[PDB]
Design a protein around this ligand. Structure first.
Ligand SMILES: Nc1ncnc2c1ncn2[C@@H]1O[C@H](CN(CCCC[C@H]2CNCc3c2ccc(Cl)c3Cl)CC[C@H](N)C(=O)O)[C@@H](O)[C@H]1O
Ligand SMILES: Nc1ncnc2c1ncn2[C@@H]1O[C@H](CN(CCCC[C@H]2CNCc3c2ccc(Cl)c3Cl)CC[C@H](N)C(=O)O)[C@@H](O)[C@H]1O
Lengths: 264, 266
């Protein structure tokens, strides 16, 4: 209870352009080295969709921030995609890239790299235009509320799949509120539907301009137990250890996990 | 071709010192079983949970590159009546011998025995666990994983084995990723079809200390390990990663984490 309120006000001085710079510009945002964090995340997402076993008509992205890369492979498989964030400054950053306003963030290195590893011969402009086409709305959300999108949100629940990258551990004061947030997102999921969850391993803080966020250090084992304790069969869970040269002064992340889990 | 690098491996290990090795890695801080997010506890949990499924049993088990260590068999001996231990260095097989016959001056594994019993939760005492391991270790043979027949021809070992266990062998003795794959393929000729393989190993490491021996290994990663297991005829049932914490990251090695693989041969 008290911790969930300190998270909320730390996130008030979250500078999205500073966030995008620390994590999606060089070095972490240079996609040329295939052993980097960028290529690893996109490969996880693409391998998982290329199986064919994750599909439907509706998808919800929990805690998108100002980022779109986590739906680049997703959007070939879902026609109504809902993106969500707690902060309006991020949804207005999401707005400017979906509507192609000036000063939108240049995501084309990531569209390029997703097209290359999907390997279906798709140019990146078609990938970007397909994502804008299928992303219907950009809604507020609070993963701590037992209903996270408000009483009667415009979103077509229950969704067929959730994507959530770097959200829960970054917004939860401790292991317990992280588990509750997972319980809360899971009610948004049609039973038998799929969760695709990316997050930081063993991280306790990261910087977003003037915001200094505190984060609950989660391990891969804690992540697996939390997915079952919320009723998922864990289909995949993989870890990326963070190389020295991607350890900048913007956080203390030690690794990144990817989870493919299916509601039971 | 890789035969030269394998010869440097052999050469370097002739400075491997068992007593010094054990102290760097199995007495505190690395061998601290009280810190539950330490690495010792994590490896034991992986083995004890895997065996607790009931899906890994049979008559014969072969431990691949045992070194002078036994923890990697502590949960396994409840399930296999015939255990084969193996190592490249006679001095290591002698260290095992010191422990098999209960000599003082052999290494004290009882902190590890006690932790395994505590984790298995069958209320067993650690002296029973040890007496059962000493009883079910039927032989300690030389092994070389770079040979096509790693135990040599017509060795004593009951072949083919029902399961294999290997802690930190393949990636620590392989000059490049190609001999690592070849070494995987050689040991899988000892495992019967449908048998299970339990692999523990270092992730992304290039040197470690085995007694002011600076031995230099090829770094591997999780996804390199998965692709090598499928490339050998295995379906991967579990692939877990332990990130070496900064506080256990001392001057012993440059290891960045540890992996556990449970795979089954088709
Ligand atoms: N109460 C709440 N309920 C719901 N959502 C809430 C609530 N409170 C805040 N939020 C929203 O949560 C989002 C959090 N993240 C950023 C978290 C930090 C990530 C960072 C950590 N350090 C390592 C590392 C990172 C990133 C990339 C790489 Cl590579 C590495 Cl290594 C959105 C990010 C985006 N999804 C994306 O994937 O980048 C914010 O937008 C915020 O507004
Ligand atoms: N050609 C060959 N064919 C077959 N076996 C051969 C051949 N050449 C040599 N060998 C044998 O390979 C064995 C390897 N050692 C340990 C290697 C280094 C481990 C070290 C690395 N740094 C990270 C780390 C470590 C240990 C613990 C933890 Cl926690 C961490 Cl993090 C025995 C391993 C033992 N099973 C055990 O598990 O300790 C030696 O005995 C040697 O004789």
């Amino acid at each position: 209870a008290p911790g969930q309120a300190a998270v909320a006000s730390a996130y008030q001085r979250f500078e999205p352009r500073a966030y995008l710079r620390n994590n999606y510009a060089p070095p972490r945002g240079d996609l040329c080295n295939p052993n980097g964090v960028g290529p690893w995340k996109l490969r996880c997402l693409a391998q998982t969709f290329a199986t064919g076993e994750v599909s439907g008509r509706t998808l919800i992205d929990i805690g998108s921030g100002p980022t779109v890369y986590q739906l680049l492979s997703a959007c070939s498989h879902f026609e109504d995609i809902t993106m969500t964030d707690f902060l309006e400054v991020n949804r207005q950053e999401l707005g400017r890239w979906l509507q192609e306003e000036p000063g939108a963030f240049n995501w084309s290195m990531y569209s390029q790299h997703a097209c290359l590893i999907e390997g279906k011969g798709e140019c990146w402009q078609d990938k970007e235009r397909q994502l804008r086409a299928r992303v219907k709305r950009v809604l507020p959300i609070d993963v701590h509320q037992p209903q996270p999108l408000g009483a009667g949100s415009p979103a077509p629940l229950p969704a067929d799949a959730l994507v959530s990258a770097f959200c829960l551990e970054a917004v939860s004061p401790d292991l317990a509120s992280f588990q509750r947030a997972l319980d809360h997102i899971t009610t948004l999921l049609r039973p038998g539907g799929h969760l695709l969850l990316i997050g930081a391993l063993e991280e306790s803080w990261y910087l977003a301009g003037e915001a200094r966020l505190t984060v609950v250090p989660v391990s891969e084992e804690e992540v697996r137990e939390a997915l079952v304790r919320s009723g998922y069969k864990v289909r995949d869970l993989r870890t990326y250890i963070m190389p020295a040269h991607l350890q900048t002064g913007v956080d203390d992340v030690k690794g990144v996990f990817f989870a493919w889990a299916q509601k039971v």
